[PDB]
Amino acid sequence: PQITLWQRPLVTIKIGGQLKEALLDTGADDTVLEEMSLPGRWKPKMIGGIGGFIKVRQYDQILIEICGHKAIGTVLVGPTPVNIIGRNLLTQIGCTLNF
Amino acid sequence: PQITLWQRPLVTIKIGGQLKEALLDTGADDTVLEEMSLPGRWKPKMIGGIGGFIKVRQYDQILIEICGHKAIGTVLVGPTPVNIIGRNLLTQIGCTLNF
Numbered sequence: 001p002q003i004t005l006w007q008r009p010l011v012t013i014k015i016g017g018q019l020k021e022a023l024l025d026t027g028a029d030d031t032v033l034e035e036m037s038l039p040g041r042w043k044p045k046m047i048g049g050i051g052g053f054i055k056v057r058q059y060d061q062i063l064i065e066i067c068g069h070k071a072i073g074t075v076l077v078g079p080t081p082v083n084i085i086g087r088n089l090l091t092q093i094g095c096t097l098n099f
Numbered sequence: 100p101q102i103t104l105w106q107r108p109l110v111t112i113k114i115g116g117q118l119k120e121a122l123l124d125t126g127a128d129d130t131v132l133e134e135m136s137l138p139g140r141w142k143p144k145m146i147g148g149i150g151g152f153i154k155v156r157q158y159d160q161i162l163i164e165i166c167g168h169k170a171i172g173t174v175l176v177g178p179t180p181v182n183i184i185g186r187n188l189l190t191q192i193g194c195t196l197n198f
């Protein structure tokens with residue numbers, strides 16, 4: 001589909017069998033979700049944001065559906081204002097910017 | 100053009116007689132640029148995300164050129180780690196997300 005930007009590009013994602021609202025964020029290299037439970041082991045990851053660098057938990061090879069499109073990749077979990085879908089997953093679903 | 104998301108979607112912008120590199124961010128409501136001088140009045144504002152909040156100066160009705168596309172809108176100026184072109188200006192150049 002084609003998404004205009006007059007409002008926030010919020011979509012429904014599915015992870016761990018549950019639906020959540022998330023933002024398609026081209027300015028984010030990675031995907032960071034609000035506190036939740038994910039399977040497997042995690043590793044430390046430092047990410048830079050508008051207000052500084054913070055520590056988050058990194059889970060790899062996680063199944064996540066974005067607006068119906070299935071993806072499997074790295075998902076970070078930490079104190080984020082909203083669920084952020086970054087470039088790592090946007091590329092998996094074939095998303096591009098156009099103008 | 101069609102911009103891939105394999106890398107950060109960076110573009111050249113023209114504002115206040117100077118060329119700058121900026122990140123096209125669908126995840127940002129507004130546009131925020133690193134410290135620079137702009138004409139006209141301004142009002143203080145706080146924007147927050149990963150890492151916390153930063154204080155910025157809000158200038159309205161600012162002329163900007165993004166990839167040869169002219170647009171006018173509010174531009175925030177402050178200690179942002181990178182220049183960010185948000186939805187308020189992305190819409191004006193007809194930028195959309197496609198997948």
Ligand SMILES: NC(=O)C[C@H]1C[C@@H](C2=CN[C@@](Cc3ccccc3)(C[C@H](O)[C@H](Cc3ccccc3)NC(=O)O[C@H]3CCOC3)C2=O)c2ccccc21
Nearest residue numbers: 027028029030049050081126127128129146147148149180
């Ligand atoms: N009101 C608003 O729209 C949000 C505020 C804050 C800031 C904001 C928008 N989106 C985000 C997320 C957000 C936060 C609150 C509400 C909606 C979305 C992320 C933004 O794209 C940064 C961009 C970035 C910052 C520093 C370095 C490099 C890129 N990327 C980023 O942190 O990537 C990291 C996290 C995942 O991968 C790594 C962000 O922090 C923002 C920017 C301009 C105007 C207003 C705002």
